[PDB]
Design a protein around this ligand. Structure first.
Ligand SMILES: O=C(/C=C/C#Cc1cccc(NS(=O)(=O)c2ccccc2)c1)NO
Ligand SMILES: [K+]
Ligand SMILES: [K+]
Ligand SMILES: [Zn+2]
Length: 355
């Protein structure tokens, strides 16, 4: 039918009390929402309500210890908040943090439900804190709970356990948590494009490399597309979709598509250093829309240039609403060609469409 949108101002309450210029800013989501309104995209959408995730829903991917620890931060005074934050890789916590993480997850569940119950065809979730770095047992890189991973499981819980869910993660950073959660799982195809730099780029693990293809029955169902050697843009991203993402995805025949949609590969992003354009993101989205009968949920992850993320995510919602793709390239950077050839060599034994 239509396009769903979920957004809740309360998720702005998560904040960094010791550094109010930390790039994971509250107004990330409010700038995005504002922009959807200015471009008249908001009123074309069906407003999906936000909700808290339950602790039972969190246990779909996370350990009870981790849930309890993060939940306990709710009552901590600043000294202990800071102490708990420092126990993870790149985490700040405020008393509202846990609530905001629950809201982000819950928001996505409701959206996935609207899709799967046929209330909407596709949807956007303007949410924070992000999630794809979060592991089963720990918080990481601004992420408390793995929103995307939880949503895949939630979708499976209201349809069937083996429901084919594709997760495309085009945030500039590798989704270590998402990869790990489904690494042995053939029901969830994880595809991530990320800056790698041989382990120099956050989160600095060889897990992000192209030769990590999955374990056990999940072998082949984890696809890393690692970038090395500086700036990449629309041509590199269109190529990777063309040669890898779409052919593998079609072959997987997903019943639902989740996008971990960080916009930190955007032109202008201070952490990403890439130059994917709003138009670029629109085309990526428009391609994914051809999958799973159009059942596509776009979930905000990273992205720290307020204008860039506002422009890029708006363009994605434009495509979900069915607007025509904007016009678009250039020869690939040589290392991007190597990256793609590497992935192709690594996944050709698992996907006939690559042969
Ligand atoms: O988007 C993401 C996460 C991005 C990140 C990061 C990171 C990790 C370690 C060090 C720094 N240094 S900093 O300048 O970006 C900085 C960061 C935060 C506060 C102050 C300075 C950044 N995942 O999808
Ligand atoms: K990624
Ligand atoms: K997998
Ligand atoms: Zn990121």
């Amino acid at each position: 039918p239509i396009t769903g949108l979920v957004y809740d101002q309360r998720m702005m309450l998560h904040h960094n009390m010791w550094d109010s210029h930390h790039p994971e800013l509250p107004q990330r989501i409010s700038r995005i929402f504002s922009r959807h309104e200015e471009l008249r995209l908001l009123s074309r959408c069906h407003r999906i309500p936000a909700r808290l995730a339950t602790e039972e829903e969190l246990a779909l991917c996370h350990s009870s210890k981790h849930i309890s620890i993060i939940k306990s931060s709710e009552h901590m005074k600043p000294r202990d908040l800071n102490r708990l934050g420092d126990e993870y890789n790149s985490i700040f916590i405020s008393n509202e943090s846990y609530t905001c993480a629950l809201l982000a997850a819950g928001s996505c569940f409701n959206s996935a439900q609207a899709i799967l119950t046929g209330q909407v065809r596709n949807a956007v979730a303007i949410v924070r804190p992000p999630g794809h770095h979060a592991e089963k047992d720990t918080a990481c890189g601004f992420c408390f709970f793995n929103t995307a991973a939880l949503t895949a499981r939630y979708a499976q819980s209201i349809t069937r356990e083996s429901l084919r869910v594709l997760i495309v993660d085009w945030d500039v950073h590798h989704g270590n948590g998402t990869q790990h959660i489904f690494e042995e799982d053939d029901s969830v195809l994880y595809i991530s494009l990320h800056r790698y730099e041989d382990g120099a780029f956050f989160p600095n693990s060889e897990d992000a490399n192209y030769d990590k293809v999955g374990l056990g029955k999940g072998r082949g169902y984890n696809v890393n597309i690692p970038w090395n050697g500086g700036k990449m843009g629309d041509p590199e991203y269109m190529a990777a979709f063309h040669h890898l993402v779409m052919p593998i995805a079609r072959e997987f025949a997903p019943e639902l598509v989740l996008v971990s949609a960080g916009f930190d590969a955007a032109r202008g992003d201070p952490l990403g250093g890439f130059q994917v354009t709003p138009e670029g993101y629109a085309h990526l989205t428009h391609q994914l829309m051809s999958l799973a009968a159009g059942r596509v949920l776009i979930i905000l992850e990273g992205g720290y240039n307020l204008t860039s993320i506002s422009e890029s995510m708006s363009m994605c919602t434009s495509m979900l609403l069915g607007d025509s793709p904007p016009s678009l390239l250039t020869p690939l950077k040589t290392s991007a060609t190597v990256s793609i050839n590497n992935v192709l060599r690594a996944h050709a034994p698992f996907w006939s469409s690559l042969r």
